[PDB]
Every structure is written in structure tokens, then in C-alpha cells.
Write a protein that binds this DNA or RNA. Structure first.
Ligand code: XG4
Ligand code: MG
Ligand code: MG
Length: 430
DNA sequence: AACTATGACG
DNA sequence: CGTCATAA
């Protein structure tokens, strides 16, 4: 079924207001209330990085200053991200993420895509389940939180959302050919049943709720996941794609949210994903390149082949700190102190990684930014990471960046640094 | 003065 | 290898 891109069953599971749930689980007083997670509190009340659905009802969003959020939502409750060594420490959320990833890993191969989401390749699990209870009809009861995108439709409770969900689910299940084990639609349905079980396990064992998308590829699975958030899952069939894409803004598709998506819209003079079908593969390749052109040609038809990579661990482990405006580091001692702070956090995380995952990083990347520099990185350099020693890593990091200081004065450092980034990479087994 | 992963290109 | 893109 590869020709039509119906060869696999892929899901994307994403936690609902993740950081907030983590804080709510720990502090019961925050449950079922407009709440948000904030980083730092000194500048404009701190930056919001997560928002409960109750808070979103007031217009509160990520990236908003807490002071501004309070203007929209006076009774907004806030949880502060932990600070260690003068910077944000996200260990609590990383540990919570592990809880969830470990549960998902029981059901199938997963690809960690973020701190709060992972792709699941359910093709094999579906096949196994299909042979079990073969020929047995699938009850609506097995899909208590599933939406079938595009349904209900046609002539024939619906004014309310749950009623709408049920009607669509009934139409879908009624039309399913259960006797053909090879049917893509049947395979998606079975995948949805498994995902219901996965999400139940996650909630029962962690207390966290999540949403999911089930489809034939990662892009459609990700898109589907967001259609009925929170605490719901959505199945997007191959057949639902034409109508779904007909009014779907191009920027909403994974990897098209940036410049490429903007160029597709501007160069082609179109707004929705579906409009891409009128162009030949060659035409798209001419405008956007061989790889991008082929990808777009297939994608607008609901077809994509990016595999769910069997990777549950990060390929890099890093620490970074910004020093905006007048806080830019202007002294040798300051720069050295901050490098040590980052190096110490990095050392802790690395040591844990080595113990937990039987591997060691072999390269240390040092990135900095100087004030007045438009570029994200004024300098990027590497050196060998031979030992998990904060002092050595900090000293080595300083050695590689020290020549960027142009100040004659011994004490002073210029131009001022607005960012420091230490990253461990090139992991090897041990 | 948003703050603290992966992948493709050349 | 370093940069730029995309992103939660
Ligand atoms: N520091 C920082 N953290 C972020 C940012 N974006 C997301 N996070 C962190 C905080 C988030 O809680 C977590 C998950 O990211 P999502 O899945 O994108 N959002 P959530 O789960 O919150 O809500 P829902 O999915 O229901 O819409 O990652 C950011 O720009 N900056
Ligand atoms: Mg989420
Ligand atoms: Mg997410």
C-alpha cells in the first residue's frame, strides 16, 4: 500500500499542557485552575512557557510575560521553573518525560520528538492484534476518546461535540470491512484501539493526560494529534486528506512553518496544502529543489515516508544561558564563572546519562554570541570531551573562546557576550 | 528583554 | 566541519 502511502500505521502522542500537568500533579492546589509555568520572575514577572487550558480560555499563551498574562487573567496561578547554578533547571520535566516515554516503549518502537511527545510505529502491533480476534467486529466502546476526522458526513445529539464524535465514529465503524485484514482503514482503526490503551496506561501510571494522532505517516499523525486536543485522539485516514487539505493553511504542516512554507505560498500564489496537487513534481523541484519538491508533491497527496526512527535518547546534551541587554558579560571572571555553572549542570546530566544509558559523549561544543552581532552565534568551536569534569570542560571551553576577547584591559571582556552554550555530542557506547 | 532539540546543505 | 532552518 506504499503507492498510496497507506503502508504504515503511525501515531504521535503529545502531552497536554505538559509542564503544567507536572506542576499540578505535585501541587494539588493548582489542579483544575487557570495556571501557567513561568521561567524567572524578575523581568516582567517572568516568561510563560506552559499554560493550562483554563488559562488559555483567557487568552494566555506561551512566550507571554507573566505580568501581561495577569492582565488577561487576574486569578492566574503560577509555578516557577526551578533554578540551579543561576539558571533554569528543567530536571523535573525531564524526569516526568522519562515516565511517559518508558510507558510508551512497552507498546512499540518510538521516536522521541520532544520532551513531551513521541512517534510510534504501530504497523507490527496492529498486524499481531489483527490476527488475534480475527474477524471480530470493533466496538465503539474500544474507542472511547477517538475522533474520526471528516465524519460525520452526509444526510442523517450532533449539536454537542460528544454527540458529534459518536456519530462520526459510528459511521466509520459501520463502513469498516472487518473481514479484510489488509485494509488500511481497518489497520488505522486497530492502531487507534492500541493508542487508546497506551493513553490509558499513561494516565493510570503517571496521572498525566495526553492527546494523539493516528495516521499512515508522521506528518499526518502530528497534524491529527492537534485537531481534538486536549485529552482526545484523532484518526486521519488517507480518504480524509482531500477535504482536510483543501482549506488547510500550508504553514500548519510539519516543516512548513518557516521560510520554506512562506516561499511555497509566495512563489506559487496559493494558501492551502490541497492547491499543491495542481503542480507537477518537476515544477515543484524547480522552485524548491529536488528533495523539497519531491516531498511536497507526495505530501499534498497525504503521502510521506519519513521513518519512525528507533531513538529514545537525545543525540546531544546541552546547557545554555542568555544574557540580554545590559546583562551581557563584560568581565573575564564573569565569563569563567558562567562557563563553570553550565559545565557543572552539564557534568551532572552527562554522568546520569552515562549511568542510565551506557554511553559517553566524546565532543564538547562551545557556542557564544557577542553583543551587536546579528547572528545567533558569534563563535562556535569544539574540543575533545575526554572526562566528565566540570572544571576541565569549563577550562577547555574558555581556552577555545578566549581569543574572541578584544579588550586590552586584563579584567575586562569585550565585546560583551549575550549568550553561552555548552553542548556534549558524538556519543559512543560504554 | 523570550528562554532552554534535530536535520540538511555545501 | 560550521551554518542555517525548524521547532517544543
Ligand atoms: N522553554 C520553553 N519551553 C517550551 C516552549 N514550548 C514548549 N515548551 C515546553 C513546555 C510545554 O509544556 C512542553 C510541551 O510543548 P507542547 O507540546 O508544545 N505544549 P503543551 O504541552 O504545553 O500543551 P499542548 O500540547 O496541550 O498544547 O514543552 C518554549 O518555547 N520554550
Ligand atoms: Mg504538549
Ligand atoms: Mg509537544
Amino acid at each position: 500500500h506504499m503507492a498510496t502511502g497507506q503502508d504504515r500505521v503511525v501515531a504521535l502522542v503529545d502531552m497536554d499542557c505538559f509542564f503544567v500537568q507536572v506542576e499540578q500533579r505535585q501541587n494539588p492546589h493548582l489542579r483544575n485552575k487557570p495556571c501557567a509555568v513561568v521561567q524567572y520572575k524578575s523581568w516582567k514577572g517572568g516568561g510563560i512557557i506552559a499554560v493550562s487550558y483554563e488559562a488559555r480560555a483567557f487568552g494566555v499563551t506561551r512566550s507571554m510575560w507573566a505580568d501581561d498574562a495577569k492582565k488577561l487573567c487576574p486569578d492566574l496561578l503560577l509555578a516557577q521553573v526551578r533554578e540551579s547554578r543561576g539558571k533554569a533547571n528543567l530536571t523535573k520535566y525531564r524526569e516526568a518525560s522519562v515516565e511517559v516515554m518508558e510507558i510508551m516503549s512497552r507498546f512499540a518502537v518510538i521516536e522521541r520528538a520532544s520532551i513531551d511527545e513521541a512517534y510510534v510505529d504501530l504497523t507490527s502491533a496492529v498486524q499481531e492484534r489483527l490476527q488475534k480476534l480475527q474477524g471480530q467486529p470493533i466496538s465503539a466502546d474500544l474507542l472511547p476518546s477517538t475522533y474520526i476526522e471528516g465524519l460525520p458526513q452526509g444526510p442523517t445529539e450532533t449539536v454537542q461535540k460528544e454527540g458529534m464524535r459518536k456519530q462520526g465514529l459510528f459511521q466509520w465503524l459501520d463502513s469498516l470491512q472487518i473481514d479484510n485484514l489488509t485494509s488500511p482503514d481497518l489497520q488505522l482503526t486497530v492502531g487507534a484501539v492500541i493508542v487508546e490503551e497506551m493513553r490509558a496506561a499513561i494516565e493510570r501510571e503517571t496521572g498525566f493526560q495526553c492527546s494523539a494522532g493516528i495516521s499512515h505517516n508522521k506528518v499526518l499523525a502530528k497534524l491529527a494529534c492537534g485537531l481534538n486536543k486536549p485529552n482526545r485522539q484523532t484518526l486521519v485516514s488517507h480518504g480524509s486528506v482531500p477535504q482536510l487539505f483543501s482549506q488547510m493553511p500550508i504553514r500548519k504542516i510539519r516543516s512548513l512553518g518557516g521560510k520554506l512554507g512562506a516561499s511555497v505560498i509566495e512563489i506559487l500564489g496559493i494558501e492551502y496544502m490541497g492547491e499543491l496537487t495542481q503542480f507537477t513534481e518537476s515544477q515543484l523541484q524547480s522552485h524548491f529543489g529536488e528533495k523539497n519538491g519531491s516531498w511536497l508533491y507526495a505530501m499534498c497527496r497525504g503521502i510521506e515516508h519519513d521513518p519512525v526512527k528507533p531513538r529514545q535518547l537525545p543525540k546531544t546534551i546541552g546547557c545554555s544561558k542568555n544574557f540580554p541587554g545590559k546583562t551581557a558579560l563584560a568581565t573575564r571572571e564573569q565569563v569563567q564563572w558562567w562557563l563553570l555553572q553550565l559545565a557543572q549542570e552539564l557534568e551532572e546530566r552527562l554522568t546520569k546519562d552515562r549511568n542510565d544509558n551506557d554511553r559517553v559523549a566524546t565532543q564538547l561544543v562551545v557556542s557564544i554570541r557577542v553583543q551587536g552581532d546579528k547572528r545567533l552565534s558569534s563563535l562556535r568551536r569544539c574540543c575533545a570531551l575526554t572526562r566528565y569534569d566540570a572544571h576541565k570542560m569549563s577550562h577547555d571551553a574558555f581556552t577555545v573562546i578566549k581569543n574572541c576577547n578584544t579588550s586590552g584591559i586584563q579584567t575586562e571582556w569585550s565585546p560583551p557576550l549575550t549568550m553561552l552554550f555548552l553542548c556534549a555530542t558524538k556519543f559512543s557506547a560504554s
